[PDB]
Design a protein around this ligand. Structure first.
Ligand code: A1CAF
Lengths: 298, 274
């Protein structure tokens, strides 16, 4: 760890601290996630073991790269690719002017490519929020912070309950579902999509029940037709107020018909019907950006 | 060949290929104990059996046991000249890493120290987990023997909905097949066969080649060698009878088949070598 010179502290969590660092020889800048092992009662934290093993196997242009794992002294250093900006700060900087639609489309396309890659490797991110989406100077945006991620089996079993930051948390999580998988990440990305368009959090709740009701007030209170099994879920109550779904013209005014269609499908109540990341890439909203590949009907 | 149905969330052949490609990144050496001339194969069987008992006591998932088994076998293949008194430390540290990867609320470090009857301190376990994870190049996400059996049981019990992610199959036949695999993993010669082949050959013994091919994708020729090897193990299980699904205090019944169990399998392992 002699060739790296710490430049600035950029982050801090329960695991440890994140620094920006500069290679003294090559001039290369990286991000160091430092874990102090003398302070840890259970050895390498479960979240670091998971994140390291997952990222060793998740190399993709829209996923922040894990470059190296260095054990030195009583310390474990995770060395990452460094990006100078996150989407949350970019949205706030763009709040008065707005993000141009082609950049919103390009960013969403890229996030869906990174997510489609995670999901085909059977990995749930489970903490997609603008503060975890990193941006470089060349127009790329990348998924970061896999500390809450989890590989899922085929089939899944019951995993850690009450995941995802509250504003980006899917309604099936809030109502206490036993099983979940890739749909929770799509919901978060849908919230983020709307947030890029309107420059305001779509559902900024301050408690689980307030988050749920903010969802109900915008998408309508779900029932058995739109979401089979919703009335049998642990936290569902027949006493919930009945609100009517709002016209997306009023929810995301700037967005055209294609965007409204894609957003609706990413915010479908039923996790079984909510659009997949792979399918979303094929949506007409991106028909200008992408060209499909010939499919072998064999 | 691929047995997955069409997947709403990804290209079925993509998901399968990645699963298959992974099993080529994770190497196994059925003869790795020749790197450690002071060890014998029975020692590995005794160690693995002990880890199985440990898992049941703490209600650890079968997946957790098989990760520990996989970390131990791959780690040993990177080392040389290990002595028998070091085995308990490598095993329990393998299980420590595995539990931290897999369980929602893993047991604490001192509990892993506790079950060694003081032959392994917490400090030694922390040293050993770093040695293992570094020697494994932090490649800690294998497809376990039991994970394959999980995939096979879903596909066998698929409806017209082709929903592959929400579990749906009889718990009691799952545990019966897992019992054959738990016996088989005690013998180091099992590593000759890919983990997915091992699991499919166990399933065949409890059903048929048609069902096996339908849920695993492999043709009878792929598994014939494995099935022939598993033959004595399967009969030793058949002579003694099929085990019963256990309930576990604090485990929901729809997860009860996923908890690791233990029985006198070292006795049964002897008969299979006849
Ligand atoms: C704290 C961090 N935690 C984490 O796990 O991030 C991974 C490990 C560190 C890796 C990383 C971070 C990074 N640049 C930034 O943070 C900039 C700093 C200046 C302001 C904008 C953001 N480049 N590379 C990714 C979460 C993701 C942001």
């Amino acid at each position: 760890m002699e060739n790296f010179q710490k430049v600035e502290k950029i982050g801090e969590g329960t695991y440890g601290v994140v620094y920006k660092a500069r290679n003294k020889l090559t001039g290369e800048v990286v991000a160091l996630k430092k874990i102090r092992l003398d302070t840890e009662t259970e050895g390498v934290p479960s979240t670091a073991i998971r994140e390291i093993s997952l990222l060793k196997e998740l190399n993709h242009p829209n996923i922040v790269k894990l470059l190296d794992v260095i054990h030195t002294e009583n310390k474990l250093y995770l060395v990452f690719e460094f990006l100078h900006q996150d989407l949350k700060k970019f949205m706030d900087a763009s709040a008065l002017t707005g993000i141009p639609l082609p950049l919103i489309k390009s960013y969403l396309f890229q996030l869906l490519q990174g997510l489609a890659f995670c999901h085909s490797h059977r990995v749930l991110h489970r903490d997609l929020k603008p503060q975890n989406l990193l941006i470089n100077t060349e127009g790329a945006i990348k998924l970061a912070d896999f500390g809450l991620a989890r590989a899922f089996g085929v089939p899944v079993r019951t995993y850690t309950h009450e995941v995802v930051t509250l504003w980006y948390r899917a309604p099936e999580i809030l109502l206490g579902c036993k099983y979940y998988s890739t749909a929770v990440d799509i919901w978060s990305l849908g919230c983020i999509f709307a947030e890029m368009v309107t420059r305001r959090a779509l559902f900024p709740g301050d408690s689980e029940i307030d988050q749920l009701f903010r969802i109900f007030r915008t998408l309508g209170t779900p029932d058995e037709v739109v979401w089979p099994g919703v009335t049998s879920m642990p936290d569902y109550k027949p006493s919930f107020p009945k609100w009517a779904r709002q016209d997306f013209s009023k929810v995301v005014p700037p967005l055209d018909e294609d965007g409204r269609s894609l957003l609706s499908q990413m915010l479908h109540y039923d996790p079984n019907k909510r659009i997949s990341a792979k399918a979303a890439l094929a949506h007409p909203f991106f028909q200008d950006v992408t060209k499909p590949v010939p499919h072998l009907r064999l | 060949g691929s047995p997955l149905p069409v997947l709403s969330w990804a290209n079925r052949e993509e998901v399968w290929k990645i699963m298959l490609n992974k099993e080529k990144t994770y190497l196994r050496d059925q003869h790795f104990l020749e790197q450690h001339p002071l060890l014998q194969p029975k020692m590995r069987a005794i160690l693995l059996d002990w880890l199985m008992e440990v898992c049941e006591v703490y209600k650890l998932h079968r997946e957790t046991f098989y990760l520990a088994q996989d970390f131990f076998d791959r780690y040993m293949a990177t080392q040389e000249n290990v002595v028998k008194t070091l085995l308990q430390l490598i095993g329990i540290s393998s299980l420590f890493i595995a539990a931290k990867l897999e369980e929602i609320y893993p047991p604490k470090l001192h509990q892993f120290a506790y079950v060694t009857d003081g032959a392994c301190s917490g400090d030694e376990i922390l040293t050993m987990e770093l040695m293992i994870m570094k020697a494994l190049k932090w490649r800690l996400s294998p497809l376990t023997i039991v994970s394959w059996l999980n995939v096979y049981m879903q596909v066998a019990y698929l409806n017209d909905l082709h929903e592959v992610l929400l579990p749906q199959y009889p718990q009691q036949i799952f545990i019966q097949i897992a019992e054959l695999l738990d016996l088989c993993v005690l013998d180091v010669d099992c590593l000759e066969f890919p983990y997915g082949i091992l699991a499919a050959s166990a399933l065949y013994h409890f059903s048929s080649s048609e069902l096996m091919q339908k849920v695993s994708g492999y043709q009878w020729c792929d598994i014939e060698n494995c099935v022939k090897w598993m033959v004595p193990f399967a009969m030793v299980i058949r002579e003694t009878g099929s085990s019963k699904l256990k309930h576990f205090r604090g485990v929901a019944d729809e997860d009860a088949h996923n908890i690791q169990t233990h029985r006198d399998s070292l006795d049964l392992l002897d008969k299979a070598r006849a």
